[PDB]
Amino acid sequence: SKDFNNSYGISHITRDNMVKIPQQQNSDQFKVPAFDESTIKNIASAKGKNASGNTIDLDVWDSWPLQNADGTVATYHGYQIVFALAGDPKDSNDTSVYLFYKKAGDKSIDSWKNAGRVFKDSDKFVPNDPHLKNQTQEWSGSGTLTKDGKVRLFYTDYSGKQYGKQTLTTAQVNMSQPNDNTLKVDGVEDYKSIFDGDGKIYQTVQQFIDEGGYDTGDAHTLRDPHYIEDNGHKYLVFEANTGTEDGYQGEDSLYNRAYYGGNNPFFQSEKKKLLEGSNKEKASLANGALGIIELNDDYTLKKVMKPLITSNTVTDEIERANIFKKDGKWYLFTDSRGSKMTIDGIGQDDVYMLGYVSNTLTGKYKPLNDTGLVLHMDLDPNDKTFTYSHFAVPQTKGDNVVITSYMTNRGFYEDNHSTFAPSFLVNIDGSKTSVVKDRVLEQGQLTV
Ligand SMILES: [Ca+2]
């Protein structure tokens, strides 16, 4: 019949694993710790210029640490460095990368200084690039300290003028130290696009357009590039959507057993309900994927590779791709909004970090804690301590990783700007994770 089973030689976030999450999630093993409201502060140095040209307090969102090749937090001439998306809510659709820095031993949020924006608004027009001139926003990515001791950034070039086109982009950030307690961004070089989708393995913005995306409610993604090295090879892992040959979006996807898991009765009943309901469109269009490309030594595209994992029928958005090696195993994480999911029992208030483990980088990823659930955040978006963009930072030693995130901090009474959330620990052991109880760290802490 119309029923089939195609894995496309890749792993999947299955409906069966997802349906089990609501009954599993109400547990301190998985719940993002409650944060103390009275202790929360804005990032003090987080000040810049609005569109009007006046200096204001910035909102600070997605942030990522400068990492060593294996994912550990780098030290750059005595400083830890964090790249953060920031902006003025009166520009709203304006997002730029900022460089924050702190002496390695310092702990407090007040110790974080701001070297300012990585890019000047003129920087994107300088190189001979196919895409950069059309950029409207700087979206998330990663930072790596090279062998050569260079600061190498990866970020997302977003073009709202080109229908929301998203390009994986790289640049070397040139740094200097004016004095012993200051870092300065000198400017950028090696500033070039890397990848914007191929069409067969990863969806292009043109396919999104052609299929009438803005009408259908489709969501096109090609963002959050995360740098990783393995066996001498260099890779980016990133948020994307499937292409025409690795399980394309559409109604046929609802007949593909690979996306359901469980038994035949489960598949038959779940499919029936999907094809019937108001979720039929949402599910059909849902084709999120965690993609992977290999880079050359100059950080240009070497090879477009098949996705590590997809979330067909489940969601169109698995964000903040993250991956590292621990204990000889490969751990893959992604954040997800319940509002973007099609799963019964998962609501608009639900926000997750999901997690998967494989013995090899491109091998089969199996769900952590049987379902994939690692973190659950369900605080209302109006709560002061709402957190988002949860990210696992691997540590030099020990079984714990540091979870960083931002805190929207939208209080009636100050402080009241998006800031670093207090960090915390998650214990990793085999295919099983747990929030380390009562070990809340400082806002924006990277290492323990
Ligand atoms: Ca889609």
Side-chain angles (χ1 to χ4, degrees):
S1 77
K2 283 278 292 170
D3 295 340
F4 65 111
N5 195 337
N6 286 346
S7 72
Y8 302 103
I10 67 195
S11 304
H12 309 287
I13 302 166
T14 66
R15 302 194 65 84
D16 189 60
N17 292 309
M18 292 298 103
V19 296
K20 283 163 172 52
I21 285 182
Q23 282 164 51
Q24 180 193 29
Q25 71 188 6
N26 196 27
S27 173
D28 279 16
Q29 176 185 351
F30 304 114
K31 183 202 67 167
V32 180
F35 302 114
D36 196 344
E37 251 173 59
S38 60
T39 76
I40 302 310
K41 303 151 90 163
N42 300 334
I43 302 151
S45 59
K47 285 166 165 53
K49 285 84 215 300
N50 61 7
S52 303
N54 302 319
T55 192
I56 37 80
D57 289 359
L58 298 158
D59 270 356
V60 180
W61 306 295
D62 314 26
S63 70
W64 56 97
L66 181 76
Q67 292 171 288
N68 302 126
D70 62 9
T72 50
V73 181
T75 313
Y76 183 79
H77 297 81
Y79 303 88
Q80 289 169 340
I81 283 163
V82 175
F83 301 94
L85 307 184
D88 176 43
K90 286 79 188 286
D91 303 19
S92 188
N93 271 6
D94 137 270
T95 323
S96 312
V97 188
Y98 281 75
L99 197 153
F100 291 92
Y101 62 99
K102 177 185 68 55
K103 296 280 182 193
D106 291 336
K107 306 301 280 282
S108 89
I109 186 164
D110 290 334
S111 289
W112 285 103
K113 312 183 95 153
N114 186 15
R117 276 187 56 184
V118 180
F119 303 109
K120 313 176 290 293
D121 284 324
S122 65
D123 268 334
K124 68 179 80 67
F125 301 106
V126 186
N128 195 15
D129 195 73
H131 306 293
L132 278 168
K133 58 160 135 59
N134 311 120
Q135 176 175 287
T136 84
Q137 296 189 49
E138 296 158 15
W139 282 358
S140 301
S142 51
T144 191
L145 186 62
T146 71
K147 296 184 173 173
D148 198 27
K150 301 287 168 200
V151 172
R152 174 59 65 160
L153 178 66
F154 297 93
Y155 84 100
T156 311
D157 164 359
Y158 175 80
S159 179
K161 73 190 66 168
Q162 280 188 317
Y163 313 92
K165 192 175 199 169
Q166 291 156 60
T167 303
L168 307 182
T169 308
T170 196
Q172 177 174 283
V173 193
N174 294 314
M175 310 287 292
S176 66
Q177 307 178 62
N179 54 63
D180 75 351
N181 59 71
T182 309
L183 279 170
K184 172 190 166 188
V185 175
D186 301 342
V188 292
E189 59 183 77
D190 210 40
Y191 192 19
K192 57 186 166 187
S193 301
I194 303 170
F195 185 66
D196 68 334
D198 65 298
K200 292 183 194 179
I201 304 155
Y202 305 105
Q203 193 196 39
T204 64
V205 75
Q206 188 68 55
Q207 283 166 323
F208 166 81
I209 299 153
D210 288 8
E211 215 63 64
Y214 274 124
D215 286 302
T216 60
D218 202 28
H220 175 64
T221 61
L222 219 149
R223 58 165 181 259
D224 303 4
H226 183 83
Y227 186 79
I228 189 74
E229 291 178 0
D230 165 59
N231 193 44
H233 304 265
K234 308 175 165 65
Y235 308 92
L236 305 178
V237 173
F238 56 99
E239 171 175 22
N241 301 99
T242 61
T244 60
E245 291 176 14
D246 55 352
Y248 199 49
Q249 63 184 46
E251 202 165 296
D252 291 1
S253 75
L254 303 182
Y255 294 80
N256 185 353
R257 293 174 187 261
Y259 304 138
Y260 291 79
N263 50 43
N264 180 57
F266 175 83
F267 157 70
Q268 297 300 352
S269 64
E270 276 288 292
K271 174 192 61 171
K272 166 191 163 288
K273 218 184 283 55
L274 254 30
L275 295 162
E276 279 173 341
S278 54
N279 268 7
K280 179 176 65 191
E281 177 162 78
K282 193 177 175 180
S284 303
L285 291 170
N287 70 338
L290 294 189
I292 189 170
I293 49 170
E294 195 184 344
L295 300 187
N296 278 300
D297 287 321
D298 57 0
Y299 303 103
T300 66
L301 170 63
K302 190 194 295 195
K303 195 183 174 158
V304 182
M305 305 166 73
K306 76 195 192 314
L308 294 179
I309 202 164
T310 83
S311 55
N312 286 76
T313 83
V314 171
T315 178
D316 218 4
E317 301 201 44
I318 34 175
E319 67 172 43
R320 296 290 316 257
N322 189 25
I323 187 153
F324 59 79
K325 191 167 177 156
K326 187 185 181 277
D327 295 330
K329 315 274 212 205
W330 283 98
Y331 289 90
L332 177 67
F333 302 95
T334 181
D335 293 336
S336 197
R337 281 171 287 168
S339 64
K340 298 290 161 279
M341 293 171 76
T342 58
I343 305 300
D344 293 326
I346 307 186
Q348 270 187 298
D349 62 341
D350 299 299
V351 181
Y352 301 101
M353 192 180 74
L354 306 163
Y356 306 83
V357 60
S358 178
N359 297 309
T360 52
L361 182 57
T362 62
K364 286 270 132 68
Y365 284 89
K366 303 178 78 149
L368 295 171
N369 311 301
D370 309 311
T371 67
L373 173 72
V374 174
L375 291 171
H376 178 239
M377 205 293 304
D378 69 354
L379 285 54
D380 192 86
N382 284 353
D383 292 345
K384 189 176 162 76
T385 57
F386 175 95
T387 56
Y388 198 78
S389 201
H390 302 90
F391 181 89
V393 182
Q395 300 302 303
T396 45
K397 47 196 266 176
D399 285 324
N400 291 328
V401 294
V402 171
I403 312 297
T404 58
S405 60
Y406 72 86
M407 184 173 282
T408 52
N409 197 23
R410 269 136 83 279
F412 197 95
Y413 295 131
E414 68 189 310
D415 277 338
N416 45 27
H417 292 286
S418 199
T419 186
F420 295 144
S423 299
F424 61 94
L425 303 174
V426 164
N427 185 258
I428 311 301
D429 189 14
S431 61
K432 309 283 163 267
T433 74
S434 190
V435 181
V436 182
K437 64 85 59 64
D438 296 297
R439 267 218 58 86
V440 180
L441 309 168
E442 279 279 320
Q443 285 174 278
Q445 189 176 327
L446 312 173
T447 49
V448 290

Coordinates of all heavy atoms in Angstrom, one line a residue, residues 203 218-219 241 249 284-288 316, ligand 1:
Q203 N 17.6 21.0 2.2 CA 16.7 21.9 1.5 C 17.3 23.3 1.3 O 18.1 23.8 2.1 CB 15.4 22.1 2.4 CG 14.2 22.7 1.6 CD 13.1 23.2 2.5 OE1 13.4 23.8 3.6 NE2 11.9 23.1 2.1
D218 N 5.5 26.5 6.3 CA 6.8 25.8 6.3 C 7.8 26.6 7.0 O 7.7 27.9 7.1 CB 7.2 25.4 4.9 CG 8.2 24.3 4.8 OD1 8.2 23.4 5.7 OD2 9.0 24.2 3.9
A219 N 8.9 26.0 7.6 CA 9.9 26.7 8.2 C 11.3 26.3 7.7 O 11.7 25.1 7.9 CB 9.9 26.6 9.7
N241 N 17.0 21.3 7.1 CA 15.9 20.5 6.7 C 16.2 19.5 5.6 O 17.2 19.8 4.9 CB 14.8 21.5 6.3 CG 14.4 22.4 7.4 OD1 14.8 23.6 7.4 ND2 13.6 22.0 8.4
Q249 N 10.1 16.4 2.9 CA 8.8 16.8 3.5 C 7.7 16.5 2.5 O 7.9 16.3 1.3 CB 8.8 18.3 3.8 CG 9.0 19.3 2.7 CD 9.1 20.7 3.1 OE1 9.8 21.0 4.1 NE2 8.4 21.6 2.4
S284 N 3.3 17.1 7.9 CA 3.8 16.8 6.6 C 5.0 17.7 6.2 O 6.0 17.2 5.7 CB 2.7 17.0 5.5 OG 1.6 16.2 5.8
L285 N 4.9 18.9 6.6 CA 6.0 19.9 6.4 C 7.1 19.8 7.3 O 8.2 20.2 7.0 CB 5.4 21.4 6.6 CG 4.4 21.9 5.5 CD1 3.8 23.2 6.0 CD2 5.1 22.1 4.2
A286 N 6.9 19.1 8.5 CA 8.0 18.9 9.4 C 9.1 18.0 8.9 O 8.9 16.8 8.8 CB 7.4 18.4 10.8
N287 N 10.3 18.6 8.6 CA 11.4 17.8 8.2 C 12.7 18.3 8.7 O 13.7 18.4 8.0 CB 11.4 17.7 6.6 CG 11.7 19.0 5.9 OD1 11.6 20.1 6.4 ND2 12.2 18.8 4.6
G288 N 12.8 18.7 10.0 CA 14.0 19.1 10.7 C 15.1 18.0 10.5 O 14.8 16.8 10.5
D316 N 9.9 20.9 12.5 CA 10.6 21.4 11.4 C 11.8 22.2 11.9 O 12.6 22.7 11.2 CB 9.7 22.4 10.6 CG 9.9 22.3 9.1 OD1 10.7 21.5 8.7 OD2 9.3 23.1 8.4
Ligands
CA1 CA 9.8 21.7 6.4

